Design a protein around this ligand. Structure first.
Ligand code: HEM
Ligand code: HEM
Ligand SMILES: Cc1cc(N)nc2cc(CNCCc3ccc(C#N)cc3)ccc12
Ligand SMILES: Cc1cc(N)nc2cc(CNCCc3ccc(C#N)cc3)ccc12
Ligand SMILES: C[C@H](O)[C@H](O)[C@H]1CNc2nc(N)[nH]c(=O)c2N1
Ligand SMILES: C[C@H](O)[C@H](O)[C@H]1CNc2nc(N)[nH]c(=O)c2N1
Ligand SMILES: [Cl-]
Ligand SMILES: [Cl-]
Ligand SMILES: [Gd]
Ligand SMILES: [Gd]
Ligand SMILES: [Gd]
Ligand SMILES: [Zn+2]
Lengths: 402, 404
């Protein structure tokens, strides 16, 4: 009845019994699979909340006390009165952790227990928004020794608009279109760059200009805010033994902070709840720098390496890419900024799978996202079968507010 | 109809072909199991109906559907069925079917080739040594002195009342795996459980890392019989690196002909339990999976040491470095030996072109993303940033229980 999952490196077999409890449907059917797609009332708000409260009161081994049943009828009473309800502070910390724990595409989940939750549900303006954010960035960065954090702003509520952070991440580099059709800086951020400027931002000319923040308070236009230079820690990229590498002028920032996803807890929704951990070198080295549609330095690196770029069978792309990753890992360690390579990351993700099978009888994971974009079969996640499904609490995508 | 995006370019296609996908796979709205290797469950009724659309698919393909000619072929495949319970495919249909099953193979990255396939009609076969003769013509034709050629050999169709034709080795060419004192393995650990099945089915085992296995063949309802491939028929490539002179001394070799022989060919409701096929290798199958998988030959650490890399710390990416060179050595060796091979960039790029071809012809293409993406340098190849739909068409190659 439950899925038989197999590790093909070792020959071990589990059954994912946690799967039957999946709370929402994904894109797949018996006739076609769409796992590779990137993007797949009071009666109902209640049945989710009752489920969350049930969870929370179990993880503190207090299932069926009467803190538990008092808290249940408290919730439907308040939904009865006001149509919604407010999370307790402890419940919100639990729910935010759970959402991390539940994220199928995150290889970093061994850490899910150690999350710092900043409660900003009493935020009232965009100026105060900025302040909560700057404090988040300072705490999480910690002068290089990175810490996992999330800041939770006011939940969605009828009669008032949403808090929204327009930027996909707290730290991103401008992307200036040319008329060649060519882009200066990061091409993934052409759209946000044009928005910023239209909202009164004075742009730069570099390939690594840190973008301002577009912050939206309920029923207000977005307001621009310049992150202070000294708050955004960056790492100049150099190579341990290719000394011409540093002359490429490449840099990347320390903190990966996702700011545009929705946090869903017990039926309540938090359109603004930015979170951050630390980088895995492959995101910087392979995807951010080598993707043909991102910074695209691959051919340039390889030519400099005097590799033979006129044929594929010389494996120039793979040699260049491996060096680019080495440079990233070395640059971050030099600068004493936290970073994890794909081998250790997947390794620890395998200890997470074991922990999770003991605790909940399974773990949701999206194989195509867990497997590194280079060196897949060298990592132990490759040979591991996985079951992908949606548990709640969770982080969801959401439309761009413009 | 599923919206499929390419994220390197931004192009959008709709897979209208997935709508004809009538046998159901392992996934549901609630869970996804697309990473499972085996989605294994493993009367006249609709054998009829399985034959009628195959036949019609065939006549549409040679644009003579609904015409006259389409007449009689339809107008009693079913007497064959009425009278004897099954039907036989005329040779053109067996060629068509075979090519379609390849074309519909979701995990196969080389399908740009699907129209070039040699089909050998071994359906008149009846004895194990006749089978063994048909196999050796295959190898000989497919190997073709290193200028490899896609080939398949089709043995008789299963029917109740008699046993199956079944080749027992998983491939025609496979290296023995010998269980050790240590409970370790010498040779290929993948082939541990075929080796002893060969061993005292008579076979005198060899001593080596690379002893080519004997073929265990099975004619209907009889016990299997062993066969030694002649050495001259098994073409192999010694592995040397173009600059690291020490690499050759590691004494690695790999054979030239990938030839799978334990899958079941299904055409028009007829099942062919023994129907081996073969193309040529993509370099990563040898370089990365066969040679580097920890449960295969597991050589990655050895090459790192010889390259004088630091194996005390994963952050040196010594695994990554060693794997690239093993691969460069695979490609180099096969070229030097004038044996047909293809790198993973060349393959994947050709598979994007297959996709675009297939969009125009049939309005989509069943493709398993996890198996199409190469197991090194995935995001570096075009297929990585391409969304794919996986679904089961027919004709098709299927897995099947092992005949013991
Ligand atoms: C501490 C170190 C962490 C590491 C090394 C890590 C690693 C990763 C990686 C490599 C991805 C794939 C994203 C991509 O390739 O584009 C990912 C996705 C994801 N991670 Fe993490 N992560 C960390 C912390 C966190 C934290 C603190 C949270 C939540 C509070 C989180 C939640 C998620 C979510 C929701 C996704 C999917 C995002 C999406 O689908 O757009 N991770 N993670
Ligand atoms: C001629 C060039 C060919 C190339 C480059 C090629 C490449 C590949 C690769 C890389 C795989 C992945 C399997 C693995 O890595 O374990 C595969 C699987 C497969 N190929 Fe192709 N192949 C070729 C010829 C053929 C032919 C001639 C056929 C059929 C007549 C075929 C049908 C299949 C099927 C059915 C699978 C699935 C195997 C499985 O599910 O275990 N291929 N092929
Ligand atoms: C916490 C975290 C840590 C870390 N090291 N890396 C992390 C990477 C991400 C990456 N998520 C973005 C993935 C994406 C987003 C949008 C679109 C589109 N359109 C396509 C792909 C998220 C969170 C991370
Ligand atoms: C035609 C063909 C060509 C080619 N270049 N490579 C090809 C590779 C294959 C690989 N099929 C075997 C893969 C496998 C087999 C058994 C189990 C188990 N248990 C798990 C995985 C098949 C056909 C190929
Ligand atoms: C289409 C394709 O599946 C998509 O671009 C995915 C593949 N796997 C990924 N995996 C991770 N970790 N991050 C990604 O951005 C992607 N991109
Ligand atoms: C669990 C996972 O799906 C499994 O290990 C797969 C992944 N993709 C693969 N793809 C190919 N071509 N061959 C394989 O053996 C595998 N292994
Ligand atoms: Cl990023
Ligand atoms: Cl093989
Ligand atoms: Gd140097
Ligand atoms: Gd230059
Ligand atoms: Gd030496
Ligand atoms: Zn699926």
């Amino acid at each position: 009845k439950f899925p038989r999952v197999k590790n093909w490196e070792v020959g071990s077999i589990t059954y994912d019994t946690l799967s039957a409890q999946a709370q929402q449907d994904g894109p797949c059917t018996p006739r076609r699979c769409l796992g590779s797609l990137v993007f797949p009332a009071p009666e109902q708000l209640l049945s989710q909340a009752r489920d969350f409260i049930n969870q929370y009161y179990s993880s503190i081994k207090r299932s069926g006390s009467q803190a538990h049943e008092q808290r249940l009828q408290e919730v439907e009473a308040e939904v009865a009165a006001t149509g919604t309800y407010q999370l307790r502070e402890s419940e919100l910390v639990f729910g935010a952790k759970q959402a991390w724990r539940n994220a199928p595409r995150c290889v970093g989940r061994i850490q899910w227990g150690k999350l710092q939750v900043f409660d900003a549900r009493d935020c009232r303006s965009a100026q105060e928004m900025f302040t909560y954010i700057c404090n988040h960035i300072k705490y999480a960065t910690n002068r290089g020794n990175l810490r996992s954090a999330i800041t939770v702003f006011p939940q969605r509520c009828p009669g008032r608009g949403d808090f929204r952070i327009w930027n996909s991440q707290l730290v991103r580099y401008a992307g200036y279109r040319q008329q060649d059709g060519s882009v200066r800086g990061d091409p993934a951020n052409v759209e946000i760059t044009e928005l910023c400027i239209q909202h009164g931002w004075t742009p730069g000319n570099g390939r690594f200009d840190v973008l301002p923040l577009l912050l939206q308070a309920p029923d207000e236009p977005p307001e621009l805010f310049l992150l202070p230079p000294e708050l955004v820690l960056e790492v100049p990229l150099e190579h341990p033994t290719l000394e011409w590498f540093a002359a490429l002028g490449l840099r990347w920032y320390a903190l990966p902070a996702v700011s545009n996803m929705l946090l869903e807890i017990g039926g309540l929704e938090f359109p603004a709840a930015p979170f951050s951990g630390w980088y895995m070198s492959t995101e910087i080295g392979t995807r951010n720098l080598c993707d043909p549609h991102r910074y695209n330095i691959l051919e340039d690196v390889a030519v400099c390496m005097d590799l033979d770029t006129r044929t594929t069978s010389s494996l120039w792309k793979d040699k260049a890419a491996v060096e680019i990753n080495v440079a990233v890992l070395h640059s971050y360690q030099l600068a004493k900024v936290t970073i994890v390579d794909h081998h250790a990351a997947t390794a620890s993700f395998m200890k997470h799978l074991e922990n999770e099978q003991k605790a909940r009888g399974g773990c949701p994971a999206d194989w195509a996202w867990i497997v590194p974009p280079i060196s897949g079969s060298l990592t132990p996640v490759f040979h591991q079968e996985m079951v992908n499904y949606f548990l709640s609490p969770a982080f969801r995508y959401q439309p761009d507010p413009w």
